[PDB]
Amino acid sequence: KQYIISEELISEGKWVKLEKTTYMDPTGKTRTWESVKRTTRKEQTADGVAVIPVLQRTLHYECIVLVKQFRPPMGGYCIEFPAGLIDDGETPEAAALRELEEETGYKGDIAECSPAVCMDPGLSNCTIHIVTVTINGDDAENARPKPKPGDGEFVEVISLPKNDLLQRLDALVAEEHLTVDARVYSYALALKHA
Amino acid sequence: KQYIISEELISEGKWVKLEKTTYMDPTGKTRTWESVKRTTRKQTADGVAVIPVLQRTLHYECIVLVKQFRPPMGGYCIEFPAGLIDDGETPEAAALRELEEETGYKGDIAECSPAVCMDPGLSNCTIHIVTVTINGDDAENARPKPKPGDGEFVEVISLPKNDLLQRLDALVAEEHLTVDARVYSYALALKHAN
Ligand SMILES: Fc1cnc2[nH]ccc2c1
Ligand SMILES: Fc1cnc2[nH]ccc2c1
Ligand SMILES: [Cl-]
Ligand SMILES: [Mg+2]
Ligand SMILES: [Mg+2]
Numbered sequence A: 001k002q003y004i005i006s007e008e009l010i011s012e013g014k015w016v017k018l019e020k021t022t023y024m025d026p027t028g029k030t031r032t033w034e035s036v037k038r039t040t041r042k043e044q045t046a047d048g049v050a051v052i053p054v055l056q057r058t059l060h061y062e063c064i065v066l067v068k069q070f071r072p073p074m075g076g077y078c079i080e081f082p083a084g085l086i087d088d089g090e091t092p093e094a095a096a097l098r099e100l101e102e103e104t105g106y107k108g109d110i111a112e113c114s115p116a117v118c119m120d121p122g123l124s125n126c127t128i129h130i131v132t133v134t135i136n137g138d139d140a141e142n143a144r145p146k147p148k149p150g151d152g153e154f155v156e157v158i159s160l161p162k163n164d165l166l167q168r169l170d171a172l173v174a175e176e177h178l179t180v181d182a183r184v185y186s187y188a189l190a191l192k193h194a
Numbered sequence B: 001k002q003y004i005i006s007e008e009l010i011s012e013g014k015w016v017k018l019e020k021t022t023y024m025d026p027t028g029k030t031r032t033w034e035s036v037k038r039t040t041r042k043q044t045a046d047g048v049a050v051i052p053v054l055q056r057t058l059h060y061e062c063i064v065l066v067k068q069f070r071p072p073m074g075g076y077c078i079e080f081p082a083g084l085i086d087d088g089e090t091p092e093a094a095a096l097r098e099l100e101e102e103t104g105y106k107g108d109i110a111e112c113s114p115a116v117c118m119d120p121g122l123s124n125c126t127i128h129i130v131t132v133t134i135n136g137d138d139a140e141n142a143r144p145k146p147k148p149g150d151g152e153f154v155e156v157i158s159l160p161k162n163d164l165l166q167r168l169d170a171l172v173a174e175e176h177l178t179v180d181a182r183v184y185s186y187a188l189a190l191k192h193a194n
């Protein structure tokens, strides 16, 4: 029923644009929306990847590997899945494995790759692939893993037991000023609910 | 170690603003970020998202999701029922209200998250994730009357919790829909718990 009529640029930065979207509602009436988009999306099937990194080690419980970073939009530290934009010509799986190694030092193995999923569809067109990666914590390559942060990247690694992830995130929130990412929190909720 | 120095307003619309954020990186170097904010927060968070567990005896538990045209995506998205919290509203109250407006279901609070970020590399947008059970056997949830607001057009989609990820992958495959990242993340953890 509904579809886009026009997209009028309002403001274009180096990294983000604001657009006036005109669309048809299902009563057949024209309406508008203020839509955010990134300037960085070329041919990619999504803007970015988030990595669900499952650290597996003999005689350890499986951990989920998370990163803590200062996020200027938030004015604060945030706990998120390892994540980055897809380079032009890069696959989602390549991007995921590269961002995981850059942000954590860990060398993962692809397990699965989502279709493009929407970050905040009432605000932005922004999409990711959610890529599940296993990390063989028994491999010597993954022994004392060194982050390789790019210019202006500063990442802390936090590995939390999958079997207690939600209470471990609650304990971190209830111990300092920091926001858990909605996707990390949804994943931790589902681990409890299953 | 890192913090906000100042925010420059680049562009304000009715619903969304684009800010140039100046921040101190940990090296002591000043850096700039293009940051999206809503104009609507007063508020624990911008929004609530409801994980509604529809419980009917002798049936599979279902997760209640909504399909909506999302102008920023230029297409239909599958999402947790969700909306912005009114000035003076509690996150819990917004949750039960948005759930009835969007689904017609009347539900009970199980748990409420702290504020979680939607896309902290882009925006300051946060939500409370609110887990709600729906007694599908109660008369008030027999023929649920969804009460949409002005310009809302929401289709209800109940999916079995125990097969959620395969069911969502199927809708994507054969309906060209975008699944929301928090829905997909929840659906992944339901599978990864085992
Ligand atoms: F009616 C509107 C139009 N554009 C928007 N962008 C974010 C919320 C919103 C509501
Ligand atoms: F380096 C930057 C600066 N501002 C940004 N806004 C979104 C991504 C990004 C990267
Ligand atoms: Cl529940
Ligand atoms: Mg990153
Ligand atoms: Mg990165």
Ligand SMILES: [Mg+2]
Pocket (backbone or CB within 6 Å): B081, B082, B083, B098, B102
């Ligand atoms: Mg809504």
Ligand SMILES: [Mg+2]
Pocket (backbone or CB within 6 Å): B082, B083, B098, B101, B102, B149, B152
């Ligand atoms: Mg609503």
